[PDB]
Amino acid sequence: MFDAFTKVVSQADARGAYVTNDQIGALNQLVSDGNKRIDVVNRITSNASTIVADAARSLFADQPQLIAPGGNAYTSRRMAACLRDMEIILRYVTYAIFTGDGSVMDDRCLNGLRETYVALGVPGASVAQGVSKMKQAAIAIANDRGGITQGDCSSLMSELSGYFDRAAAAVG
Amino acid sequence: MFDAFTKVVSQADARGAYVTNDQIGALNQLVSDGNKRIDVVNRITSNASTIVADAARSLFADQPQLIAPGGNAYTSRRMAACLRDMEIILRYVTYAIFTGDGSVMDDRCLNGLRETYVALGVPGASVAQGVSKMKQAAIAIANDRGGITQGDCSSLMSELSGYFDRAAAAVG
Amino acid sequence: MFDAFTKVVSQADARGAYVTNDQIGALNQLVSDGNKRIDVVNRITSNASTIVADAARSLFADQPQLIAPGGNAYTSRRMAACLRDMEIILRYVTYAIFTGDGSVMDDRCLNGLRETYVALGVPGASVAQGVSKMKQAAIAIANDRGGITQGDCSSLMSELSGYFDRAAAAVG
Amino acid sequence: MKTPMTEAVAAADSQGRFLSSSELQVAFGRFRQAQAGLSAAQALSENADSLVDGAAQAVYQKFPYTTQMQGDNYASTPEGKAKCARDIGYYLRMVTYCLIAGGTGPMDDYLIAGIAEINSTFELSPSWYVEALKYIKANHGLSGDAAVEANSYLDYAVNALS
Amino acid sequence: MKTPMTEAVAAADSQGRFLSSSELQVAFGRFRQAQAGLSAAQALSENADSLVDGAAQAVYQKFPYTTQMQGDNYASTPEGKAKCARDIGYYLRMVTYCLIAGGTGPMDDYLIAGIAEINSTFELSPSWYVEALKYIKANHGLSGDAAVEANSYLDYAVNALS
Amino acid sequence: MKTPMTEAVAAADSQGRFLSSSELQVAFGRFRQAQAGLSAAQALSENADSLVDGAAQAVYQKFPYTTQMQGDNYASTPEGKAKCARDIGYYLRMVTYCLIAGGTGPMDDYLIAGIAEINSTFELSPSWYVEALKYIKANHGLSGDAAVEANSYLDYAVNALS
C-alpha cells in the first residue's frame, strides 16, 4: 500500500533516483498541512452515515428507475447492498485522504470493480452519480468554516475531489 | 431455486404486480394435476438406471466413434463418466418436473456446462443425442397406460419434453 | 505423468494398437543407454547452482535493461524470483531427461506459464535467453569426456536440447 | 428463494441422489393444500386498494406526528404519503406472494433481508409498519384457514420488525 | 498415469527439489529390468489373435448360456461375439502395456477405473472375464520371469473383477 | 510496502470499518516527526557521491583481496569496482527512502527480501557491505535525532547481513 511518502519513494526507485529537493519541498508542505488533513478525515468519518444516506436519497430522486419494482436498487436486499457499496467507497476515500495516496482505493476497492458490476448488472453510471453526490456533501462538511481554526484547505479539497472522481471513473 | 409457484411470484415482483386471476387459474390447474406430476417423477426415478443404460446403448450404436479406441467414451473411466453425466442430467430433469420449473436444472447443472465440455473435449452434440434418447424412453415409461388410473397427462409430457430439450440445447 | 514407456503406450492406446516391433526396438535402445541417461541427470543436478548462476550472469550482461533500476530483475526480490525461475525450469528439464518424456515439464511447469508471465510483466524473450544459456552450459557439463567411461551420448544431448528448447518456446 | 418443494430438491441434490419417498410426500402435501393459499392470495389482491389506503390512515391516526412534522422520513407532504402507501402495498403484495408460494420465501428474499438497514438509514420507524400490518390482519375479512395463512405472514413481518 | 519412474519425479516435485540419490536408484533398477517386460509384451502381441479367440471360446465353454440366451449383454449373436472378443483383446492389450510400462498404470487408467460401473450398467458378469484371463495365463507359453510378469497383470485384473 | 500510516489503514480495512481515534493518532505522530526524516534524507542525498566512494575505498582497505583476486565476484577490474560502488549506492539510496517513508518498508521491499539468495548465488560476502554501511554511519556528519534515524536504517541493514 502507498502513502504520499512511499508513492514518491516508489517512483524514485523505478528511476534509480534520490528524491529531489522539489519533491522534498512538496512532501514538507503536505506535512505542514497535516492537522488540516486529519480534520478532513475526522469530519468525513464522523458524518459518514448522513453523507451516504443523503447522497443515496438524492440518487434515487434523480434516478427513479433504480427503485421502481424491477430496478437494481429495488427489494430490501438490493437497497441494502447499494447503501453498503456507497459506504464502502466513502470508507476507501477516507483511507486515501488519510494516507495522501489513492493506491489503497485502487488496490482494495476499485481494481476489477467495473467487471464485478457488469457480472451483477449493477449500473455503474448510477454508482458514479452516487459517488459524485457523496463528493459534494463531503467537501461541504470537510471545508465548513464553523468550529475550526480559520485557514485555507483548498489543496486538500482538490486532492479529496480527485479520489471521489477516481472512484466515479472506475465503476463505469 | 424456483418452483412453478415462486417462478410466477418472481416474474410478478419484477413488475410490481399482484399475480393475476389468469395466473392463479393456471397454478390451480397445475395443483389439480399434482398426482399425475408425482407419478411422472416416480416412474422416471424408479426406472432411472434402465433409462440411462438403454439411452447410452442406443447412443453408442448410432455414434460408434465415441467407443472406438481414441473416442471420447473409450476407456472404462471415460465410459463411466459419460454414464454418470447421463444420470446427472436425468436427475436434474426429475427435479424440474417435481418442482414445475427448470431453474434447478439451469442453475445447478446446465449453466456453464457448454464451456465445461469444450474444456474437456466432450462432444455436446452426442450428449444432446443421449439426452433426447433418455427423453423418448422417459416419456414412454411416464405416459404408459398400464397400472395407473386412466386420464390425460399430455400437458405434463409437453413440460417434461421441454426440460429434456432445454438440457439438449444447453450442452451444444 | 508419462515416461518414455508410458508415452508410447498412451499413443498406442488412442489407436487401439499393440506397440510395434519398431517401437519396442526404440525403447530397447533407450534402455541400453540408461547408464548414460542417469549420468546426464547426475551431472546437471550436481552442477545445478553453477548452471543457474553462470547463465543468469550471462543473461544480465547481454540484457542490461533487466538489472537497471526499474528493470524486471531489479530489486533483490525480483532478482531472487528470476534466479528461482531459472532453477525451477532446470529442475523440470532434469525430470524430463530422467523420465525420457517432456510431459512432466508441460503439465507442471510450462502450461499457462506464457500467460503467468504476461500477467506479471516478466519478459519471456529474456526467460528464453536464460533457458538457452542454461542449455549450453548443461550440455557442456553433461557431455564432458573427463572422468567417465568413453562413449557416444549424442542422442541424449539432442533429447536434452529439445527439453530446453521446449521451455524456451513455451515462455514467449 | 426456497420453499418446502425446493428444499426437498436441495436435500436430494446435496446427496447426489434422486428424490426419496419422503421428498415425494412433500409434493403430495403441497398440492393437497396449495389451492387454499391461491384462493387467499386472490381474495387479498382484489381488496388491495382498500386495505392499503385503510392501513395508511390507521398508521397516521396512531402516529399523528408522521403527517405534521417536516422531514424526508415523514408523510407530511403528498410525496411522503405516496412513499408510505407504496411501502404498505409492498408488504401486502409480499403476503400474497407467500400465500402463492406456500412459505415465507418471497417476503424473506424481497423485503425482510435488509429491512433493518433500510429503516435505520432512512429513519423509518418499524412501529409504523407494525400498525399497518395489524390493520390488514383485522380488516382482510378472511375466515378460518385462509385467515390463519394470511395472518401467519402478517405476523411473521410484525415479528421481523419487533 | 504413474510408474515407479514418474512417482520418483512426483516425490521430488512435491518437495520442490532435484532428484535424490534414492530416486536415481529407481532409474538404475528400471533400466536393469525393462528389457524383460519389453520382450514379454512383444511375445504376447505376436500371439494376440490365438490368445483372444481361444480365450473367448474358453468363456463360451464355461458359460454356455452366454451364446444361447437372447439379450444385449450376451454373445448369442455375431454382434455380441464381436463385442466379447473385442473386450478380451482390450484386456490382453492392457497386459502388454503394463509389461512395457513396468507397472499397472496403463490398466489402472484405461480399464480398471470405472470397470465395475460398466459391468453393472451393461449387465456383464465379471466372472466371464476372469475365465478369459485365466485361459490367457494358461496358454501364453511364457517361461520364468516373463511368465511371472505377464501373470502378475493377468492376476491383478482377475483380482479387480473378484 | 507498509508504513505506520498504511498499517493503520490495513487494520481498519481488515475490520471493515472507518479509521478509529487511535488510528488518527498515528497520523498526528507521523506528521509531527516527518520533517526530521525528510531533512536527514536530503542531507545524505547531497553527500551521496563522497559517502559511496569513501565507503567503497573503506571496504577495499579492510578486504584487500577484493581488488587483487580474479573472479566475477571481485572488484579487481573496473567493471567489478563499478558493480561494488553501484551496490553501495543502492544501500545509501534505500536509507534515504526509509527516512522519507518513516520506516524500513522501502529497504524491506527493494533490498532485504532476497538479499541472502543474491549474495549466495553471486558469491558476494555480506561482511563487505557491513563495512560500507559502518563507514557511512561514521562519516555522514548528521547530529542528534537525524543521526539516530539514519543510523537506525544503516544498523537495520547491518543486522540483515549479520
Ligand SMILES: *[C@@H](C)[C@H]1/C(=C/c2[nH]c(/C=C3N=C(/C=C4\NC(=O)C(CC)=C4C)C(C)=C\3CCC(=O)O)c(CCC(=O)O)c2C)NC(=O)[C@@H]1C
Ligand atoms: C479545512 C479542512 C478547514 C480548516 C482546517 C484547519 N485546522 C487547523 C488546525 C488543527 N486541526 C486539528 C485537528 C484536530 N484536533 C482535534 O482535537 C481532532 C480530533 C482528534 C482533530 C482532528 C488540530 C490539532 C489543529 C491545531 C490546533 C487548532 O485547533 O488550531 C488549522 C490551522 C492551521 C494548522 O494547520 O494548524 C486549519 C486551517 N480550517 C478552515 O477554515 C477550513 C474550512
Ligand SMILES: *[C@@H](C)[C@H]1/C(=C/c2[nH]c(/C=C3N=C(/C=C4\NC(=O)C(CC)=C4C)C(C)=C\3CCC(=O)O)c(CCC(=O)O)c2C)NC(=O)[C@@H]1C
Ligand atoms: C400420466 C402420468 C398417466 C396417468 C396419471 C394419473 N394418476 C392419477 C392418480 C393418482 N396418482 C397417484 C400417485 C401415486 N400413488 C402412490 O401410491 C404413489 C407412490 C408413492 C404415487 C406416485 C395417486 C395418489 C393418485 C390418486 C389415486 C389413484 O391412484 O387414482 C390419475 C387420476 C386423476 C388424478 O389426477 O387423480 C391419473 C390420470 N394416467 C394415465 O392414464 C397417464 C398415462
Ligand SMILES: *[C@@H](C)[C@H]1/C(=C/c2[nH]c(/C=C3N=C(/C=C4\NC(=O)C(CC)=C4C)C(C)=C\3CCC(=O)O)c(CCC(=O)O)c2C)NC(=O)[C@@H]1C
Ligand atoms: C555422455 C553422457 C558421456 C558418457 C556416458 C557413459 N556412461 C557410461 C557408463 C556408466 N554410467 C554410470 C553412471 C553412474 N555410476 C555411478 O556411480 C553414478 C552415481 C550414483 C552414476 C550416475 C554407470 C553405473 C555406468 C556403468 C559403469 C561405468 O562406469 O562404465 C558409459 C559406458 C557405456 C554404458 O552405457 O554403460 C558411457 C559412454 N560417456 C562419454 O564419453 C560421454 C561424454
Ligand SMILES: *[C@H](C)[C@H]1/C(=C/c2[nH]c(/C=C3N=C(/C=C4\NC(=O)C(CC)=C4C)C(C)=C\3CCC(=O)O)c(CCC(=O)O)c2C)NC(=O)[C@@H]1C
Ligand atoms: C448503489 C449506489 C448501487 C447498487 C449497488 C449494488 N451492489 C451490489 C452488489 C455488490 N457490490 C459489491 C462491491 C464490493 N464489495 C466489497 O467487498 C467491495 C470492497 C472490496 C466492493 C466495492 C459486491 C462484491 C457485490 C456482490 C456481493 C453482494 O451482494 O454483497 C448489489 C446487489 C446485486 C444483486 O443483484 O444481488 C447492488 C444492488 N445498485 C444500484 O442500483 C445502485 C446504482
Ligand SMILES: *[C@H](C)[C@H]1/C(=C/c2[nH]c(/C=C3N=C(/C=C4\NC(=O)C(CC)=C4C)C(C)=C\3CCC(=O)O)c(CCC(=O)O)c2C)NC(=O)[C@@H]1C
Ligand atoms: C456421455 C453421453 C458423453 C461423455 C461424457 C463425459 N463427461 C466427462 C466429464 C465431466 N462431466 C462433467 C459434468 C458434470 N459434473 C457435475 O457434477 C455436473 C452436475 C453439476 C455435471 C453436469 C464434469 C464436471 C466432468 C469433468 C470431471 C469428471 O470427469 O467427473 C467425461 C470425462 C472427460 C475426460 O477426458 O476425463 C466424459 C467422457 N463423453 C462422450 O463421449 C459422451 C458424448
Ligand SMILES: *[C@H](C)[C@H]1/C(=C/c2[nH]c(/C=C3N=C(/C=C4\NC(=O)C(CC)=C4C)C(C)=C\3CCC(=O)O)c(CCC(=O)O)c2C)NC(=O)[C@@H]1C
Ligand atoms: C528470470 C530469468 C526472469 C524474471 C523472472 C521473474 N519471475 C517472477 C515471478 C514468478 N515466476 C513464477 C513461475 C513459476 N512458479 C512456480 O511455482 C513454477 C513451477 C510450477 C513456475 C514456472 C511465478 C508463479 C511467479 C509469481 C510469484 C512469485 O513471485 O514467486 C518475477 C517476479 C515478478 C514480480 O514483479 O513480482 C520475476 C522477476 N524476471 C526477469 O527479468 C528475467 C527475464
Ligand SMILES: *[C@H](C)[C@H]1/C(=C/c2[nH]c(/C=C3N=C(/C=C4\NC(=O)C(CC)=C4C)C(C)=C\3CCC(=O)O)c(CCC(=O)O)c2C)NC(=O)[C@@H]1C
Ligand atoms: C409509512 C408507514 C410511513 C413512511 C414511509 C416512507 N418510506 C420512505 C422510503 C423508503 N421506503 C422503502 C421501503 C422499501 N423498499 C423496498 O424495496 C422494499 C421491499 C420491497 C421496502 C419495504 C425504501 C427503501 C425507502 C427509501 C428509498 C426510496 O425512497 O424508495 C419514505 C421517504 C424517505 C426519504 O428519506 O425519502 C417515507 C416517507 N413515512 C411516514 O411517516 C409514514 C407513517
Ligand SMILES: *[C@H](C)[C@H]1/C(=C/c2[nH]c(/C=C3N=C(/C=C4\NC(=O)C(CC)=C4C)C(C)=C\3CCC(=O)O)c(CCC(=O)O)c2C)NC(=O)[C@@H]1C
Ligand atoms: C465377453 C467375455 C462377453 C460379453 C461381452 C460384451 N461386452 C459388451 C459391451 C461393452 N464392453 C465394454 C468394455 C470396455 N470398454 C472399454 O472402454 C474398456 C476398457 C478399454 C472395456 C473393458 C463396454 C464399455 C461395453 C458397453 C459399450 C460398448 O458397446 O462398447 C457387450 C454388448 C452389451 C450391450 O448391451 O450392447 C457384450 C455382449 N458378453 C458375453 O456374453 C460374453 C461371454
Ligand SMILES: *[C@H](C)[C@H]1/C(=C/c2[nH]c(/C=C3N=C(/C=C4\NC(=O)C(CC)=C4C)C(C)=C\3CCC(=O)O)c(CCC(=O)O)c2C)NC(=O)[C@@H]1C
Ligand atoms: C562491493 C561491496 C563488492 C562487490 C560487488 C559486486 N556486486 C556484484 C553483483 C551484484 N550485486 C547485486 C546487488 C543488488 N541488486 C539489486 O537489485 C539490489 C537491491 C536494490 C542489490 C543490493 C546483484 C543482484 C548482483 C548480480 C547481478 C548484477 O550484476 O547486477 C558484482 C558482480 C558479480 C558477478 O558475478 O557479475 C560485484 C563485483 N565485489 C567486491 O569485491 C566488492 C568488495
